[PDB]
Scaffold this active site. Structure first.
Site, PDB file in Angstrom:
ATOM      1  N   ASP A  52       0.833  -1.198   0.000  1.00 40.51           N
ATOM      2  CA  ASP A  52       0.000   0.000   0.000  1.00 40.51           C
ATOM      3  C   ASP A  52       0.871   1.253   0.000  1.00 40.51           C
ATOM      4  O   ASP A  52       1.605   1.506   0.955  1.00 40.51           O
ATOM      5  CB  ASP A  52      -0.931   0.006   1.216  1.00 40.51           C
ATOM      6  CG  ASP A  52      -1.833   1.226   1.258  1.00 40.51           C
ATOM      7  OD1 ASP A  52      -2.212   1.726   0.178  1.00 40.51           O
ATOM      8  OD2 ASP A  52      -2.163   1.685   2.373  1.00 40.51           O
ATOM      9  N   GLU A 124      29.771  11.673  -9.226  1.00 37.32           N
ATOM     10  CA  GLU A 124      30.842  11.937  -8.272  1.00 37.32           C
ATOM     11  C   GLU A 124      30.239  12.445  -6.967  1.00 37.32           C
ATOM     12  O   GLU A 124      30.488  13.578  -6.550  1.00 37.32           O
ATOM     13  CB  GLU A 124      31.844  12.951  -8.833  1.00 37.32           C
ATOM     14  CG  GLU A 124      32.701  12.417  -9.975  1.00 37.32           C
ATOM     15  CD  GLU A 124      33.730  13.424 -10.462  1.00 37.32           C
ATOM     16  OE1 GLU A 124      33.548  14.635 -10.212  1.00 37.32           O
ATOM     17  OE2 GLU A 124      34.723  13.004 -11.093  1.00 37.32           O
ATOM     18  N   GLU A 126      29.814  13.473  -3.588  1.00 36.96           N
ATOM     19  CA  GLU A 126      30.560  13.838  -2.392  1.00 36.96           C
ATOM     20  C   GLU A 126      29.640  13.744  -1.179  1.00 36.96           C
ATOM     21  O   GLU A 126      28.429  13.583  -1.326  1.00 36.96           O
ATOM     22  CB  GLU A 126      31.118  15.254  -2.528  1.00 36.96           C
ATOM     23  CG  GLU A 126      31.999  15.456  -3.753  1.00 36.96           C
ATOM     24  CD  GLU A 126      32.360  16.912  -3.979  1.00 36.96           C
ATOM     25  OE1 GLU A 126      31.596  17.791  -3.529  1.00 36.96           O
ATOM     26  OE2 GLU A 126      33.408  17.176  -4.604  1.00 36.96           O
ATOM     27  N   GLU A 210      37.734  15.518   0.946  1.00 41.37           N
ATOM     28  CA  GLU A 210      37.376  16.675   0.131  1.00 41.37           C
ATOM     29  C   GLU A 210      37.811  18.006   0.743  1.00 41.37           C
ATOM     30  O   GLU A 210      38.393  18.045   1.826  1.00 41.37           O
ATOM     31  CB  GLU A 210      35.877  16.685  -0.178  1.00 41.37           C
ATOM     32  CG  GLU A 210      35.536  16.177  -1.570  1.00 41.37           C
ATOM     33  CD  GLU A 210      36.104  17.062  -2.667  1.00 41.37           C
ATOM     34  OE1 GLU A 210      36.191  18.290  -2.458  1.00 41.37           O
ATOM     35  OE2 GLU A 210      36.467  16.529  -3.736  1.00 41.37           O
ATOM     36  N   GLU A 218      34.755  11.951  -0.521  1.00 49.43           N
ATOM     37  CA  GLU A 218      34.283  11.573  -1.849  1.00 49.43           C
ATOM     38  C   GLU A 218      34.825  10.208  -2.265  1.00 49.43           C
ATOM     39  O   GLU A 218      36.011   9.921  -2.096  1.00 49.43           O
ATOM     40  CB  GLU A 218      34.656  12.624  -2.897  1.00 49.43           C
ATOM     41  CG  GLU A 218      34.189  12.268  -4.303  1.00 49.43           C
ATOM     42  CD  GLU A 218      34.520  13.337  -5.324  1.00 49.43           C
ATOM     43  OE1 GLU A 218      34.923  14.444  -4.917  1.00 49.43           O
ATOM     44  OE2 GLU A 218      34.374  13.066  -6.535  1.00 49.43           O
ATOM     45  N   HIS A 267      29.047  15.732  -9.566  1.00 51.21           N
ATOM     46  CA  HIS A 267      29.355  15.869 -10.983  1.00 51.21           C
ATOM     47  C   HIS A 267      28.914  14.626 -11.748  1.00 51.21           C
ATOM     48  O   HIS A 267      29.215  13.502 -11.347  1.00 51.21           O
ATOM     49  CB  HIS A 267      30.853  16.109 -11.184  1.00 51.21           C
ATOM     50  CG  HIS A 267      31.364  17.348 -10.514  1.00 51.21           C
ATOM     51  ND1 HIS A 267      32.703  17.669 -10.467  1.00 51.21           N
ATOM     52  CD2 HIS A 267      30.715  18.344  -9.867  1.00 51.21           C
ATOM     53  CE1 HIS A 267      32.856  18.810  -9.818  1.00 51.21           C
ATOM     54  NE2 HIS A 267      31.666  19.240  -9.443  1.00 51.21           N
ATOM     55  N   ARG A 336      37.262  26.585 -15.110  1.00 52.47           N
ATOM     56  CA  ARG A 336      36.832  25.873 -13.911  1.00 52.47           C
ATOM     57  C   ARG A 336      35.596  26.500 -13.271  1.00 52.47           C
ATOM     58  O   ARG A 336      35.265  26.206 -12.123  1.00 52.47           O
ATOM     59  CB  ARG A 336      37.973  25.808 -12.893  1.00 52.47           C
ATOM     60  N   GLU A 350      31.058  16.413 -18.659  1.00 51.00           N
ATOM     61  CA  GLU A 350      30.898  16.537 -17.213  1.00 51.00           C
ATOM     62  C   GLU A 350      30.034  17.733 -16.831  1.00 51.00           C
ATOM     63  O   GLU A 350      30.468  18.882 -16.924  1.00 51.00           O
ATOM     64  CB  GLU A 350      32.262  16.641 -16.524  1.00 51.00           C
ATOM     65  CG  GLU A 350      32.183  16.636 -15.002  1.00 51.00           C
ATOM     66  CD  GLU A 350      33.516  16.929 -14.341  1.00 51.00           C
ATOM     67  OE1 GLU A 350      34.330  17.664 -14.940  1.00 51.00           O
ATOM     68  OE2 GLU A 350      33.753  16.423 -13.224  1.00 51.00           O
ATOM     69  N   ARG A 352      28.728  19.763 -13.981  1.00 47.60           N
ATOM     70  CA  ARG A 352      29.168  19.955 -12.602  1.00 47.60           C
ATOM     71  C   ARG A 352      28.099  20.560 -11.690  1.00 47.60           C
ATOM     72  O   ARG A 352      28.309  20.696 -10.485  1.00 47.60           O
ATOM     73  CB  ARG A 352      30.431  20.818 -12.572  1.00 47.60           C
ATOM     74  CG  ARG A 352      31.661  20.143 -13.158  1.00 47.60           C
ATOM     75  CD  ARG A 352      32.621  21.164 -13.748  1.00 47.60           C
ATOM     76  NE  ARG A 352      32.804  22.318 -12.874  1.00 47.60           N
ATOM     77  CZ  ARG A 352      33.749  22.410 -11.943  1.00 47.60           C
ATOM     78  NH1 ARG A 352      34.602  21.412 -11.761  1.00 47.60           N
ATOM     79  NH2 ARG A 352      33.839  23.501 -11.195  1.00 47.60           N
TER      80      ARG A 352
HETATM   81 MG   LIG Z   1      35.252  16.418  -5.436  1.00 49.40          MG
END
Ligand SMILES: [Mg+2]
Ligand SMILES: [Mg+2]
Ligand SMILES: [Mg+2]
Lengths: 449, 221, 450, 451
Positions: A52, A124, A126, A210, A218, A267, A336, A350, A352
């Protein structure tokens, strides 16, 4: 494992006593009930397991269909237990609000278009390891307090939790990445998690401390197809939580537990495959990307606000996504601050932006559907590197864009209207809760006025 | 009246403090109970004579008074940038408290209520976490623009104008609608730009701050 | 087990040192005295076991007759002990004791066969329960309180350290959201599995176990059905295992229908089906129900308030049986979650959602059967499936008033004696009188300042 | 006081700084707001005092308050010199009596009595008992629910070692059901009781008697002289205010709960009753049973006949039925000797004593309901049962509200009790019963937790 007989063989071999019939709810929290191993073998493969869903958050009788490929022995249970994931169907038709089913139907729509046969995702995720976590929201008071033996705010403590004196070597702010012990106090615990993850089927690659000094970690494992990748992350979360819990600690996937230090991101690496061949590769372009890969980026950029409604669905997500974190929707190779990053078969995309406070099945699917929409319509992304598209400023704004732009999700009936309407309705409620709750910051700013 | 309220605030704060207690004008210190609002009763006078009263009207409001309301409603979100300038202000203005920009004599959900020399407009929306000089002025300039442009307010009662959902929304409205303030150089572009800048700074601080609610909601996920 | 020789064979095969001669009282609590194993074999099968029933609540020297098939090895007792349920009879006549609830269940099964309707009445209770870490309560002149606590409870999300002195590691439950996320959010997983193993050890065929909606440590364990009387025996064995497993683990388990306010209460849904010669009788039509099953529902609706006097006999029961969002509507359905009677061939059964597990299973299961049989024999049509919906009693006295008025469907075949009905009401009205005397903390909140 | 000039003269002489504009809400709790004395002498007699009763329990725009200066008295507790004045609620336009105003109902009840001609005055004299505690705490949460009272007179403290002040136990504490009425030091609250008596005299009450009551855990009773129905309600509201404040400023708590503790005597409020016309008593007749005239006898019959509907106003709390227990005026009969009777009969002193009510009610609504019931018996010659199959009080508040719902025509007579008030009163009290329906009790843990 693959067959009913394969499961029965493992039960007799390892002396399995019980079976945890588990699944993932709409939010992203794993739900389960435990049945005897003999009861599982007798019913699950025949008429399945009934339940249920009246109390399960985000659903409202339903039927549970087993997937033995996701089965693993529980390394935390006192009694020997086998953990099996189930898909929700009608008592037969795939349930509208089952997130795992969305991933399955997403893999089907991918093949139907003829674009590809496999979409490989690699998270990825973390997380933070805290020695103590406590919070409350009442009329008289509202608070949260975390603690860690690695924490920089404990540098001047006289005595630890166990009675032993302070022997220092605690992390500094934004300097937890990534010195060796004794500075890193959670190396051995991280290894316990890594071992348990390897034990439950995952192929691991890397683990480290990290940036955030307050015990941020991570662990990285090998990629997989979309639906299975979602299964692996749910298994990743369950093992991470349990291992810390059995060690007298707490692990969390909050995108931003503490202020003044790095948040927690997830990521997502993206790659399309066909006939066992990479489709994002082309040595004649900018980042060695194919036209298909470039178009995949474009569709992800165009529908970004709708995508981040699933990849960053919590109110806490927008305390990480703050300018000064990938808040700019543009792709590059060396930059970055770009949301999309480009690092033959290893060639991948990727994103991020996402954080691990989301439902992985919905998160991975939303990214795929956005990419495929960009592929089918040849959506050209902006040039690599002041009119750069930003991430949504709030959760409300994200839900606004999802409501005005969700046709790319409903393609091939992958995302249902009932699911998306439910998802919005749930998140708006969370926003309404925030609208009601006074904050400690407001006391600091407005009390004396 | 601004001098009185500041004097009022100073006495309330000091009298409480010297009694070993703490008084606050926060619009919403606690959750689950009533907030703190600063209703503003306003009226225009000329030659020692009132102007809002008129026997030939709904609530007994002269055209000069009705247009004052019309200007107050049309420039609502812009005015609330000064009458409700706190992040905490929007925990009281929750549609759960006046939030409907419409005027009435009987209804309580109305942001503007109307209770000869006693005929006045009551703005229930503001809260005492504001600058009285700025709050009272913005309400006046809003009304005057309504009178000078004969702005007819919506009919006294599913399509009501609402208060902004956040401090951010109010500042966007103030930024794109402030000519009625700059009239007669009452409010300057210098002050307005500064006011928005300061408040958007407080919004950025909230953008950086994790909340105990999010721990209750997302920690276990 | 079936006979004396089978009993002696088991006593030797397991080295049983003592025998717990147990029986259920009128209320619903198991009473017992312990004898040596040899003394059990020597007298229980010949002259039975005598006992002084003067101090047993609701009874007043009688004889006890064993049901060897109810025997099971005690998994808690320090000394190797075998627990056997007994039946109460008049020593000079062997006549079944009038107030023995287990005998009522046994006389209900016999009456069922006499009608020719069926020979087997299957019952399957979904007994929920709470696991608490601390429970304390008192009722003095100066004070009156209760205080429960749990490591899973939402009211402990802000505490610094727990009972063992270790720091708060969170993952505690929220209100009405304990159903049913995986650990560590579920802190009572390993304890529940300990209970499940013990239930298997004592002979129960289990199906399912999970955490319930109430965040403050509410659970539920489901097991295979059984014939009426035996299902009553199994439920008694069920409650004993749950109580002891939690106790020896340093915790408290309760089947209280409503221990806390603001969150979900504790219920006991009863799955019901009639069988004849091994064939299901409820299967056929709308909902896959037969005429016999529909008339069973009609008789269950008609005598509802009288049946609830046995299925919901606590003052605490009517804090769960509240229109505040609970099965309080006497109507049957297959989809409606407001219906007190739900309908989910050999599995086509009736789900009575009203009862709670603070009752006597022998009396509860019998009362439901006698109501259904009365509907079948008299062709009582239930109201149409789905304003004028029949309601459950709003108080315990109202239920007793209804039982005092409508009880002839119970006295049929002398399943329920008039002696039992009057005694049952007398005890319940006595408890109502106790509440009539007691001031409540709520009243201080409402009336003190006045 | 009598006129506007009287109050103005008093304010100057006594240096009165503020005026407490007071009224009684529907439930029975006095509400107020404070204004400058000069502000009170400028608007109250002319425009009146406006207020918003939207937040007041059981009232819902703005309403109008009109002062009854005869009710005024100087507050003996306030730091700043304050004159407490009671007000009546009317419409801010029509000046018509507000339907949900209990005091106005009492005033409209005195008017209906005159319209009949039976009498021109109904006199009421309450015997309101109460408890005095040194500590009272209670809480109703999901995790726990409790109440705890404590007293230095309490029998449960006989074995205590150290008092709240640090001093050793010097005994002389009460025993269960034996606080009526030993001399000090056994009576620990004599001086505080006298302080209450003194303040009651200061505010204008004509007191008759003061003593310690049956319950040993600090139960007391203070009697004052009778008065007309409406003013009797005024006197009681002032009575309960002085009692509450005198105890509070003494570091104690005073309560009028009918049954705060179990095992010992409850707290009641006996209501003496008589009808007067042209200064002549009407309940006296020499040649009858209890000296009762036909008017007095018919009055009783009206009380008995509508007992359950009357008890919906005289005993309107859930806590009331913990005192009204056959363990107590439960039997609706009247006697001149029997104490078990709900009505007792003790030449101008002949009166009817209703022993059922408790002081947790609204005095304006309580006294009015009893009269309208009594007036119903007179107008119909309703004969009460034989003085000595006996009518019982309702066993619950729900039964009282059920009874009020079917039998309330005698209340609606002469527009005294409006349908809006009766509907609201029932709706409020059923909400309280709903709260009880949701709350688990400590007793149930004792009875059912182990099952
Ligand atoms: Mg990292
Ligand atoms: Mg359940
Ligand atoms: Mg007395």
């Amino acid at each position: 494992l693959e067959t009913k007989a394969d499961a029965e063989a493992l039960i007799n071999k390892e002396g399995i006593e019980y079976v945890s019939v588990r699944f993932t709810d709409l939010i992203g929290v794993q739900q389960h009930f435990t049945v005897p191993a003999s009861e599982f073998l007798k019913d699950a493969f025949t008429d399945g397991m009934p339940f249920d869903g009246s109390s399960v958050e985000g659903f409202q009788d339903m039927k549970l269909v087993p997937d033995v490929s996701t089965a693993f022995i529980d390394p935390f249970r006192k009694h020997k237990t086998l953990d099996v994931a189930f898909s929700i169907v009608d008592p037969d038709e795939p349930y509208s609000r089952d997130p795992r089913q969305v991933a399955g139907k997403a893999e089907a729509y991918l093949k139907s278009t003829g674009i590809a046969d496999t979409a490989s995702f690699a998270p990825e995720a973390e997380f933070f390891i805290f020695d103590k976590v406590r919070f409350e929201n009442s009329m008289q008071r509202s608070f949260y307090e975390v603690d860690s033996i690695e924490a920089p705010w404990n540098s001047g403590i006289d005595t630890e939790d166990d009675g032993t004196p302070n022997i220092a070597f605690k992390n500094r702010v934004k300097k937890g990445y990534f010195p060796v012990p004794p500075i890193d106090h959670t190396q051995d615990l991280r290894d316990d998690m890594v071992a348990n993850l390897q034990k439950v089927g995952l192929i691991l690659e890397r683990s480290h401390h990290e940036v955030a000094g307050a015990g941020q970690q991570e662990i990285n494992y090998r990629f997989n197809s979309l639906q299975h990748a979602g299964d692996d992350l749910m298994k990743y979360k369950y093992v991470v939580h349990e291992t810390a819990a059995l060690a007298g600690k707490a692990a969390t996937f909050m995108p931003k537990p503490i202020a003044g230090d790095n948040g927690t991101g997830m990521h997502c690496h993206q790659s399309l495959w066909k006939d066992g061949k990479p489709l994002f590769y082309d040595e004649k372009n900018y980042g060695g990307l194919s036209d298909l890969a470039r178009w995949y980026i474009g569709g992800l950029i165009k529908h970004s606000s709708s995508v981040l409604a699933f990849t960053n669905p919590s109110l806490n997500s927008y305390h990480r996504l703050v300018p000064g974190a990938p808040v700019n929707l543009v792709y590059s190779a060396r930059n970055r601050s770009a949301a999309i990053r480009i690092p033959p078969a290893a060639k991948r995309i990727e994103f991020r932006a996402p954080d691990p406070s989301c439902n992985p099945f919905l998160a991975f699917s939303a990214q795929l559907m956005a990419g495929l929409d960009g592929i089918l319509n040849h959506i050209e992304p902006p040039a690599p590197v002041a009119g750069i598209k930003q991430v949504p400023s709030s959760l409300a704004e994200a839900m606004d864009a999802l409501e005005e732009d969700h046709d790319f999700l409903t393609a091939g009936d992958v995302f249902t209207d009932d699911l998306i309407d439910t998802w919005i309705s749930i998140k708006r409620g969370e926003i309404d809760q925030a609208r009601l709750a006074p904050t400690p910051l407001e006391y600091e700013l407005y009390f004396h006025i | 009246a601004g001098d009185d309220l500041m004097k009022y605030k100073y006495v309330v704060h000091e009298t409480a403090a010297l009694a070993g207690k703490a008084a606050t004008f926060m619009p919403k210190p606690i959750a689950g109970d009533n907030g703190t609002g600063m209703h503003c009763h306003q009226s225009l006078w000329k030659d020692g004579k009132p102007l809002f009263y008129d026997e030939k009207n709904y609530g007994g409001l002269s055209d000069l008074a009705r247009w004052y309301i019309g200007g107050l409603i049309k420039h609502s979100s812009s005015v609330l940038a000064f009458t409700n300038p706190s992040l905490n202000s929007y925990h009281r203005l929750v549609p759960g408290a006046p939030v409907n920009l419409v005027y009435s004599a009987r209804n309580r959900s109305a942001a503007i209520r109307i209770p000869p020399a006693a005929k006045r407009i009551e703005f229930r929306a503001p809260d005492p976490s504001c600058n009285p000089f700025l709050a009272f002025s913005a309400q006046l300039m809003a009304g005057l623009d309504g009178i000078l442009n004969h702005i007819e307010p919506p009919a006294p009662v599913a399509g009501i104008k609402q208060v902004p959902s956040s401090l951010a929304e109010a500042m966007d409205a103030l930024e794109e609608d402030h000519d009625f303030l700059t009239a007669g150089d009452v409010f300057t572009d210098d002050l307005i730009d500064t006011w928005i800048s300061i408040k958007r700074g407080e919004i950025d601080q909230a953008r950086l701050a994790p909340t105990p609610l999010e721990y209750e909601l997302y920690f276990h996920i």
